[PDB]
Scaffold this active site. Structure first.
Site, short mmCIF file in Angstrom:
data_model
loop_
_atom_site.label_atom_id
_atom_site.label_comp_id
_atom_site.label_asym_id
_atom_site.label_seq_id
_atom_site.Cartn_x
_atom_site.Cartn_y
_atom_site.Cartn_z
N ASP A 1 9.51 38.34 -47.00
CA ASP A 1 9.74 39.67 -46.46
C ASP A 1 10.65 39.60 -45.23
O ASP A 1 10.59 38.64 -44.46
CB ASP A 1 8.42 40.34 -46.09
CG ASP A 1 8.53 41.85 -46.01
OD1 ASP A 1 9.56 42.40 -46.44
OD2 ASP A 1 7.58 42.49 -45.51
N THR B 1 13.37 46.80 -44.85
CA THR B 1 13.29 46.20 -43.52
C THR B 1 14.55 45.43 -43.15
O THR B 1 14.94 45.42 -41.98
CB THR B 1 12.08 45.27 -43.42
OG1 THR B 1 12.25 44.16 -44.30
CG2 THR B 1 10.81 46.02 -43.80
N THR B 2 15.18 44.77 -44.12
CA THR B 2 16.41 44.03 -43.87
C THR B 2 17.65 44.90 -43.98
O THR B 2 18.64 44.66 -43.27
CB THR B 2 16.52 42.85 -44.84
OG1 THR B 2 15.28 42.14 -44.89
CG2 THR B 2 17.63 41.90 -44.42
N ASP C 1 3.13 46.02 -51.01
CA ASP C 1 4.44 46.65 -51.01
C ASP C 1 4.65 47.48 -52.28
O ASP C 1 5.20 48.58 -52.22
CB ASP C 1 5.53 45.59 -50.88
CG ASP C 1 5.68 45.07 -49.46
OD1 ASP C 1 5.59 45.89 -48.52
OD2 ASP C 1 5.87 43.85 -49.29
N1 LIG Z 1 18.08 43.21 -59.84
C1 LIG Z 1 18.80 43.98 -58.99
N2 LIG Z 1 19.84 44.72 -59.43
C2 LIG Z 1 20.57 45.49 -58.60
N3 LIG Z 1 20.33 45.59 -57.28
C3 LIG Z 1 19.32 44.90 -56.70
C4 LIG Z 1 18.48 44.03 -57.55
N4 LIG Z 1 17.56 43.47 -56.74
C5 LIG Z 1 17.79 43.93 -55.48
N5 LIG Z 1 18.84 44.78 -55.46
C6 LIG Z 1 19.37 45.47 -54.26
O1 LIG Z 1 19.18 44.66 -53.10
C7 LIG Z 1 18.78 45.46 -51.98
C8 LIG Z 1 17.74 44.73 -51.15
O2 LIG Z 1 16.48 44.75 -51.83
P1 LIG Z 1 15.26 43.82 -51.36
O3 LIG Z 1 15.82 42.61 -50.65
O4 LIG Z 1 14.38 43.60 -52.57
O5 LIG Z 1 14.41 44.71 -50.32
P2 LIG Z 1 15.04 45.36 -48.98
O6 LIG Z 1 15.77 46.58 -49.47
O7 LIG Z 1 13.83 45.66 -48.13
O8 LIG Z 1 15.94 44.28 -48.42
C9 LIG Z 1 18.24 46.77 -52.55
O9 LIG Z 1 18.85 47.88 -51.89
C10 LIG Z 1 18.61 46.77 -54.02
O10 LIG Z 1 19.44 47.89 -54.32
#
Ligand SMILES: Nc1ncnc2c1ncn2[C@@H]1O[C@H](COP(=O)(O)OP(=O)(O)O)[C@@H](O)[C@H]1O
Ligand SMILES: Nc1ncnc2c1ncn2[C@@H]1O[C@H](COP(=O)(O)OP(=O)(O)O)[C@@H](O)[C@H]1O
Ligand SMILES: [Mg+2]
Ligand SMILES: [Mg+2]
Lengths: 180, 532, 523
Positions: free
Chosen positions: C56, C89-90, C387
């Site tokens: 996270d 959060t990121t 989450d």
């Molecule tokens: N399999 C995927 N296909 C397309 N976009 C993705 C995928 N996994 C994550 N993302 C994109 O990466 C971004 C970061 O998601 P994540 O790291 O899971 O949580 P957070 O948004 O809290 O950083 C999200 O805004 C999402 O749109």
């Protein structure tokens, strides 16, 4: 408050406490309620005896050995429409007695209506932001005392003004005493 | 000679030190004057960050050890406690007056004549301020309070979003107005609940029509939504009964100890049944409530809130028209509860706002209350928003109490300086230079406003002086005195129809306080410090 | 020595702004590692002596001690974003860092921050308007859509191989937690869903239960351990003879007084037990302690008793069955008896007794049983489940959907670029900079994927330039452009709106500091 009657109180209005070591021994289930009922009846009788004289501004002296005013007596005096000022020291008693003209009362058996001082205005004032203040204006039999309120922005300026006022008063006193 | 055992200074050493201290104090808070200056940041020794730019907080959290600066600090504190707005301008004016009087003192001039001239100039400025007054109730009225609130909230974090905040402040002031002798319109402040909770932005911070409580429900079995409930205000602990210190229990018969122990718990049950005999739903208690007493409220379908503050309970009883009963005693010898002293709320809904929950109370039938729940980002933004809201409320209260508004900016100071310059020709004594110094000291506000804006200061000052001189003489051009100062572009505009609006009680009090401080400080020329 | 202030340090404005911008850029570059499905896991070393292995973006930030006020404000806004919605959060930190980076260029051009903040607010308003306009509705009755949304939301964590059951578990937990008490207020407080972690077993055995789980045991081995349909009762008082509180004294002078008192104590105990037995109980759940006479009296009537329970556990038991906690044994009545229990089995999970109460009629409180290896994996699984539950709750509270990946960001950037053509003055350069700064998420995703930033970026730009391509995103597993209508990646609109608002507020708060005065020893 309009046309109030100031009254000095030199006794406490709480639980009856004797000069010796007193205690209550409870052995029955009804005594716990009987003691509270008797205490409430005594408080109500004291409030009725205070209200019977027709007082409006009550002054209670400071007490350190016991509570000068409990919550029940305060609630009863508030319900009876009586202002309570429980903040009187033991050094300003003569000044108050000479200003407002009220004899001190230390027993409910002598708290007669004729021992009260007649007042014309007993209200409080609020400043812009430096605490409250109580003022008593209007007396039937005024004395030979007066007070001077000194204001200012800083405490040093107020102290300087007070010192100047004291010096002027001393100069006037010396001029009156010398007559020259 | 002179056995004192301490450092002393006689002559121009203490005066120069005081002048330098005043200049440093003025320059410290010279980066947050006007809507152009930014905010500050104060960090302690453990890592706590504090972001503020009101003026009084910066002087309070700075650890001042000099008496000459302590005087200015306490003066700013008194100014903030009195009115509530204008804490840095008065200090800047006092510092400029001190710097101007130092040059006159160093010119072989007695300080008494300078003090007399400063007092005369202050009296003339006070008498001239009452001439330029605009009645707020003689024009539109509603459009002036909004402008005043926007001006008061123009040098804060909500400078852009000031249109909705001004309306919210106006509505809160109109709903918080109390009724007394019906002789003067009194608008008391510090009566709304300002809750700080992170989560949403600034546009989602609406105004709640009612009082808000920062407490949660007691037991989980109590409902959280009761329509048309009764508010009960209590001021006593709702726990088990306990005897006093002077009343002991000596058990002499085993056939009565169980009865006494049962009555000790049945007394509270009977008291609760007598209290809830009138059909009460909302019960507010200041003290603690035992776990055994909550079961009755759970089974009866009522709410019981504990650990309630005294001020909140008093405000609730005043808004709902209830009466805080410290005991159940009456005019006789029996504890009875009546239904004539009970509340009458509309709807009590405990809504969850960011993890933690809070109890919301709408308007009742006696009076109307209000509460503003500001939502920021972290913790400093919420504090800044609360400070800005308090400043706006104080400004609106002062404006409504004074019933007059004066166009602020670089116009009133220039007009006062011109009036003092035109008045120095009548005083043919030694007080001619003192009035000139007093007039030149008032021109430090436009200079600082132009310096903070990073624009031309000398040209703007000369243009303002020429405009004021042209508006003073010739009665055909008497409408040029409301020019003000526009720092968005650097040119005069109309500061009366739709510009800057400020009350008249802030300038006079600040000027008088600055004059008094300058007088009480200029009479110092000997410092004696003893050894600890 | 005459001084104005002791132990005080004051800086300028440009240096403070540069330091804050550098700190924000360093924080953004440190946090940019954990982003996208191709990211890696991190581990921390707390001063206690444990290991915090997770993925996270907020857990790694809360375990780093800093000294800069900008870093503290960033940690605070990240923790508020985590406490608000739980996701994003990121992204908010990366957006704030990119905004600071693109604003330092204008700050270096002797530009006042007031116009910068005004342009930032005007751009945030347009971003919110565009996000509300491009909203997509969704039905709450379709379980497949919710399952797909949860799977696409949790596809980043290590549960990408076990989300086939974790999604259904989270959906069942959300459906069971949702309860409407009195009135028209539907609360969704996540306090009755206790997630217990037990080491051992396989990860496939982790399944949600229709009840609660108490880690305790019976008071006597002679009591029953497997009841069909019992009547579980609840209590809050003590079943033992304790002292009073009014300071009572006993003065005896005869002989049979001690025996009379000892007999009256047992008589009162038996009367209390009969008052408890008169309502015909079965499983006694009390929070206090039980002696021996009450235990024997309960065993004489075949009644089970459990000692030492928590308040949250008692509330969960009351919410699962349907009874209430009563502290008055004399006034227990009949309506305060729960009959929703259908199974009460006590098993042993590795030299430890556990009480299982399942097979309920209509329970409202569930207990998630997690079976893994050590403790870090169990904590990671619990955090992922929490989450997912928060995401499902935010979706059910606001039925709005936006295209995930980098499609919505590119659409908002194109809208802001097309809207900036009708502007004048000096407010167009920041309005275009904040629009070009929204491409920091797809650029980072591409750098973590195929590392073809310029080519894929210009390809996505040329694709979004058309008037009929607004859902085209970048795949985080391959590295080619693919429409979101055929993939299945969706994110809640409220979460993105909250992230954007938090980033804008943080940028506004950081773009208004020009003096740091530290050294007053607090107060
Ligand atoms: N399999 C995927 N296909 C397309 N976009 C993705 C995928 N996994 C994550 N993302 C994109 O990466 C971004 C970061 O998601 P994540 O790291 O899971 O949580 P957070 O948004 O809290 O950083 C999200 O805004 C999402 O749109
Ligand atoms: N919108 C505005 N336009 C022109 N002048 C302003 C505006 N807002 C504030 N000022 C001026 O800036 C000065 C400083 O006010 P401010 O920074 O709000 O704090 P304080 O009033 O306590 O000094 C005021 O004297 C006022 O005349
Ligand atoms: Mg102001
Ligand atoms: Mg995520």
């Amino acid at each position: 408050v309009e046309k109030a009657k100031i009254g000095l109180i030199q006794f406490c209005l709480s639980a009856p406490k004797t000069d010796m070591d007193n205690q209550i021994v409870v052995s029955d289930y009804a005594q716990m309620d009987r003691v509270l009922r008797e205490e409430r009846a005594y408080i109500l009788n004291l409030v009725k005896q205070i209200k019977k004289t027709g007082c409006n501004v009550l002054l209670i002296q400071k007490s350190i050995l016991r509570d000068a005013l409990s919550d029940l007596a305060l609630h009863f005096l508030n319900k009876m429409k009586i202002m309570v000022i429980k903040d009187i020291e033991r050094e300003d008693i003569e000044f108050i007695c000479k200003t407002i003209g009220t004899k001190p009362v230390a027993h409910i058996d002598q708290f007669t209506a004729d021992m009260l001082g007649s007042a014309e205005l007993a209200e409080e004032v609020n400043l812009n932001g430096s605490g409250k203040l109580l003022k008593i204006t209007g007396c039937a039999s005024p004395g030979k005392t007066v007070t001077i309120v000194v204001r200012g922005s800083n405490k040093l300026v107020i102290e300087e003004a007070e010192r100047s006022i004291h010096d002027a008063l001393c100069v006037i006193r010396c001029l009156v005493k010398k007559r020259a | 000679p002179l056995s004192v055992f301490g450092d002393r200074s006689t002559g121009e050493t203490i005066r120069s030190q005081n002048v330098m201290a005043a200049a440093s104090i003025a320059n410290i808070v010279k980066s947050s004057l006007g809507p152009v200056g930014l905010d500050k940041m104060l960090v302690d020794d453990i890592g706590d960050v504090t972001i503020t730019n009101d003026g009084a907080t910066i002087l309070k959290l700075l650890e001042v050890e000099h008496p000459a600066a302590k005087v200015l600090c306490e003066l700013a504190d008194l100014q903030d406690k009195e009115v509530g707005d204008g804490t840095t301008s008065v200090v800047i004016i006092a510092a400029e007056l001190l710097k101007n009087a130092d040059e006159l003192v160093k010119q072989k001039i007695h300080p008494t004549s300078v003090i007399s001239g400063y007092r005369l100039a202050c009296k003339e400025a006070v008498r001239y301020i009452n001439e330029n007054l605009i009645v707020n109730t003689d024009e539109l009225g509603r459009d002036c309070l909004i402008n005043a609130a926007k001006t008061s909230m123009s040098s804060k974090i909500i400078g852009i979003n000031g249109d909705f905040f001004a309306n919210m402040v106006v509505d809160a002031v109109l709903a918080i107005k109390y009724t007394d002798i019906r002789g003067q319109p009194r608008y008391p402040v510090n009566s709304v609940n300002i809750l700080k909770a992170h989560g949403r932005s600034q546009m989602e911070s609406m105004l709640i029509s009612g009082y808000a409580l920062n407490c949660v429900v007691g037991s989980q079995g109590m409902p959280k939504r009761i329509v048309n409930a009764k508010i009960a205000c209590l001021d006593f602990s709702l726990q088990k009964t306990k005897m006093k210190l002077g009343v002991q229990v000596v058990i002499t018969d085993p056939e009565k100890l169980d009865q006494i122990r049962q009555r000790e718990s049945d007394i509270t049950k009977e008291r609760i049944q007598k209290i809830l005999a009138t059909g009460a739903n909302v019960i507010l208690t200041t003290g603690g409530i035992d776990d055994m007493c909550l079961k009755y409220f759970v089974e009866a379908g009522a709410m019981a809130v504990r650990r309630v503050l005294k001020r909140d309970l008093k405000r609730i009883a005043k808004a709902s028209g209830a009466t805080i009963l410290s005991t159940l005693a009456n005019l006789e010898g029996e504890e009875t509860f009546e239904a004539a002293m009970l509340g009458q709320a509309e709807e009590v809904v405990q809504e969850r706002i960011c993890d933690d929950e809070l109890i919301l109370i709408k308007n009742t039938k006696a009076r109307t209350s209000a509460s503003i729940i500001l939502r920021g980002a972290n913790d400093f933004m919420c504090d800044e928003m609360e400070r800005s809201l308090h400043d706006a409320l104080c400004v609106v209260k002062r404006v409504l109490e004074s019933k007059s508004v004066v166009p602020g900016g670089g116009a009133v100071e220039a007009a006062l300086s011109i009036y003092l310059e035109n008045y120095a020709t009548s005083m043919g004594s030694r007080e001619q230079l003192a009035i000139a110094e007093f007039a030149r000291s008032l021109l430090v506000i436009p200079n600082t406003l132009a310096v903070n804006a990073a624009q031309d200061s000398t040209d703007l000052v000369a243009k303002l002086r020429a405009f004021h001189n042209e508006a003073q003489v010739n009665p055909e051009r008497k409408n040029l005195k409301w020019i003000g100062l526009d720092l968005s572009n650097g040119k005069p505009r109309d500061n009366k129809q739709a510009g800057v609006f400020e009350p008249t009680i802030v300038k006079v009090k600040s000027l008088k306080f600055a004059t008094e401080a300058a007088i009480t400080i200029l009479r110092i020329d000997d410092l004696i410090k003893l050894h600890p | 020595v005459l001084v104005l202030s002791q132990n005080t340090k004051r800086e300028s404005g440009r240096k403070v702004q540069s330091g804050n911008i550098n700190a924000a850029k360093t924080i953004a570059d440190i946090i940019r590692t954990c982003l996208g499905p191709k990211s890696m896991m991190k581990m921390l070393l707390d001063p206690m002596g444990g290991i915090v292995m997770t993925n996270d973006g907020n857990a790694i930030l809360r375990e780093i001690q800093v000294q800069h006020p900008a870093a503290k404000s960033m940690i605070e806004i990240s923790r508020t974003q985590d406490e608000e919605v739980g996701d994003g959060t990121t992204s908010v930190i990366i957006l704030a860092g990119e905004m600071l980076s693109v604003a330092e260029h204008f700050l270096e051009q002797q530009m006042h921050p007031t116009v910068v903040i005004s342009a930032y607010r005007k751009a945030l308003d347009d971003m919110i308007s565009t996000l509300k306009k491009i909203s997509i509705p969704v039905d709450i009755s379709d379980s497949d859509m919710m399952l797909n949304i949860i799977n696409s939301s949790i596809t980043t964590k290590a549960i990408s191989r076990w989300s086939s059951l974790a999604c259904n578990i989270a959906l069942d937990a959300v459906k069971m937690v949702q309860f409407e008490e009195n009135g028209r207020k539907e609360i969704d407080i996540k306090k009755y869903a206790r997630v217990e972690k037990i080491p051992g077993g396989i990860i496939e055995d982790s399944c949600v239960l229709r009840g609660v789980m108490i880690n305790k045991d019976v008071t006597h081995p002679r009591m029953r351990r497997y009841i069909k349909n019992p009547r579980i009762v609840l209590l809050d008082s003590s079943l033992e003879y304790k002292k009073g509180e009014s300071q009572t004294d006993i003065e005896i002078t005869r002989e049979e007084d001690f025996t009379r008192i000892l007999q009256m104590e047992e008589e009162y105990i038996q009367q209390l037990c009969e008052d408890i037995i008169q309502l015909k109980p079965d499983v006694v759940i009390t929070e206090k302690g039980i002696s021996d006479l009450a235990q024997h009296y309960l065993m004489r009537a075949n009644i089970t008793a459990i000692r030492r329970v928590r308040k949250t556990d008692n509330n969960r038991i009351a919410r699962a069955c349907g009874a209430r906690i009563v502290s008055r044994p004399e006034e227990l009545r009949e309506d305060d008896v729960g009959t929703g229990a259908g199974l009460l089995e006590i098993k042993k999970i590795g030299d430890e007794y556990f009480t299982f109460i399942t097979d309920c009629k209509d329970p409202k409180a569930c207990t998630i049983l997690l079976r893994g290896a050590s403790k870090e994996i169990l904590s990671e699984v619990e955090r992922n489940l929490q989450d997912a539950m928060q995401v499902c709750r935010n979706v059910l509270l606001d039925p709005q959907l936006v295209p995930g990946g980098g499609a919505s960001e590119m659409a908002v950037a194109h809208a802001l670029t097309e809207k900036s053509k009708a502007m004048t003055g000096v407010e167009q350069w920041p309005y275009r900079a904040v629009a070009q700064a929204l491409e920091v998420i797809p650029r980072t995703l591409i750098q973590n994927c195929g590392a073809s930033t310029i080519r894929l970026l210009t390809s996505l730009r040329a694709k979004h330039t058309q008037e009929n391509c607004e859902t085209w995103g970048v795949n985080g597993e391959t590295g080619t452009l693919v429409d979101m209508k055929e993939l299945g990646i969706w994110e809640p609109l409220a979460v993105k709106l909250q992230t954007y608002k938090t980033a804008v507020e943080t940028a506004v708060l950081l773009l208004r500091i020009d003096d740091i005065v530290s050294g007053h020893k607090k107060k």
